[PDB]
């Protein structure tokens, strides 16, 4: 396992994480759910990650990738590549979620 | 490259991200409402069917399968799909299967 998929609200809160997060970043799903992904991001990378979330909602379903350091469970910084896109449905004007694929770089 | 698709329990495309164009040659609109098994080489079709039956039993754990996908220009592309069932946090009901689809080459 190299990656896991997460669903976020527009502000960055984890609302679903697949069980591969254990092998990838060391956390059980319940240790991520309800928290903001930005809370696991190295301070120096935090604005970069915030901008990505603002930009991905403008791209309207097109994918945006970003790299940043993620705080693993054993308190080491892991280089992470996240590819993000918005999810919507056509009986709605609202962008409902952001879908992220979170891949451990090395 | 790769794209994410959302499926019902039987394999019907209910969402596909736009990277499907570069990966398999179809617009999302050309896949939606169809079963992924309809794009699968006959020889791989039972293997892909079993995967959908098995992934629902694995309850959130990932299952990978490889199969040949009929691209838009009518060539067989080897695909690696990693699948897991999705349910809302702390909620029991399986709503969808999520697939990450890579053309292996
Ligand atoms: F993050 C995931 F769990 F993997 C996910 C959830 C949903 C969904 N959430 N509520 N309804 N669908 C939709 C997608 C997709 F973008 F692939 F379609 C992915």
Residue numbers in the entry:
A (entry chain B): 360 to 465
B (entry chain A): 361 to 465
Paper text:
We have previously used NMR-based fragment screening, isothermal titration calorimetry (ITC) and microscale thermophoresis (MST) to identify several compounds which bind ARNT PAS-B with micromolar affinities; two of these, KG-548 and KG-655, are further known to disrupt ARNT PAS-B interactions with coactivator proteins. However, the binding modes of these compounds remained unclear without NMR or X-ray co-complex structures available at the outset of this work. To gain more insight on how KG-548 and KG-655 bound ARNT PAS-B, we used our pressure NMR analysis, confirming that ARNT PAS-B retains a flexibly-accessible interior cavity with a stdev(c*_i_* [^15^N]) of 84 x (2×10^-10^ ppm/bar^2^) (**[Fig fig4], S5**). Repeating these in the presence of the KG-655 ligand, we observed a drop of a stdev(c*_i_*[^15^N]) to 51 x (2×10^-10^ ppm/bar^2^), consistent with an interior binding location for this small ligand analogous to the HIF-2*α* PAS-B examples above. However, similar studies with the larger KG-548 ligand show a stdev(c*_i_* [^15^N]) comparable to the apo protein, with an observed value of 96 x (2×10^-10^ ppm/bar^2^) that suggests that this compound binds in a different mode than KG-655, potentially outside the cavity. We subsequently verified this external binding mode for KG-548 by determining the X-ray crystal structure of ARNT PAS-B with this ligand soaked into the crystal (**Table S2**). Finally, our comparison of the ARNT PAS-B binding compounds KG-548 and KG-655 provided an outstanding example of the power of the pressure NMR method to quickly and accurately provide mode-of-action binding site information even with limited structural data available. In these cases, high pressure NMR – using rapidly-acquired spectra without needing any chemical shift assignments – indicated different binding modes between the two ligands, with KG-655 binding primarily to an internal site while KG-548 bound externally.
